[PDB]
Design a binder for this molecule. Sequence first.
Ligand SMILES: [Zn+2]
Ligand SMILES: [Zn+2]
Ligand SMILES: [Zn+2]
Ligand SMILES: [Zn+2]
Length: 211
Amino acid sequence: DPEVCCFITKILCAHGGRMALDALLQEIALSEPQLCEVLQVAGPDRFVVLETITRSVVATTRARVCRRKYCQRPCDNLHLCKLNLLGRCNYLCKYSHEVLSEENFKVLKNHELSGLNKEELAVLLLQSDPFFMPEICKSYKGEGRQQICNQQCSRLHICDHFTRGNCRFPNCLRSHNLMDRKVLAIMREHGLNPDVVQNIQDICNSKHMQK
Ligand SMILES: [Zn+2]
Ligand SMILES: [Zn+2]
Ligand SMILES: [Zn+2]
Ligand SMILES: [Zn+2]
């Protein structure tokens, strides 16, 4: 049911975007096969199930924040301040700080996320929309060479395709490890804590299996 999915998303986001199946069952009030049937039918575009023997669920969405500076309407994306959600916008900003605006509520409705408050929505977006990640080094060509990039580098040395869930290269040498200490340090500065990065990592790992 749509009312069931929406409610799970809500529980997960209220616990930081991730829950172990045991903790979820003790909130949703369904049986393990009832909950698993819901999760599997909804798909990996809503819930990502992972075994770490210990089953865990990660909340995700196909909803996206508009990347344009001056966007000409109509637009099917959310219109908000990226920096404000990353805790880097308190100062004037030309982007909307009204998360649950009229236009955004319409978008949330298309993605069945109208139930969510601004905190739950932010948790969800920080781990689902690749737009919230730091800029990846444009001159990064992969590991195992002398010239990895054109510097002495302050940017991410990760596979750009992997973050967009479209790394289709047979034996890719560009890093897929967002859990690397050097990467986590760049993430922390951008406004993404290690728990958020762990969720991004697992959603990206899931997207890599389908494509
Ligand atoms: Zn737009
Ligand atoms: Zn702002
Ligand atoms: Zn670089
Ligand atoms: Zn790759």
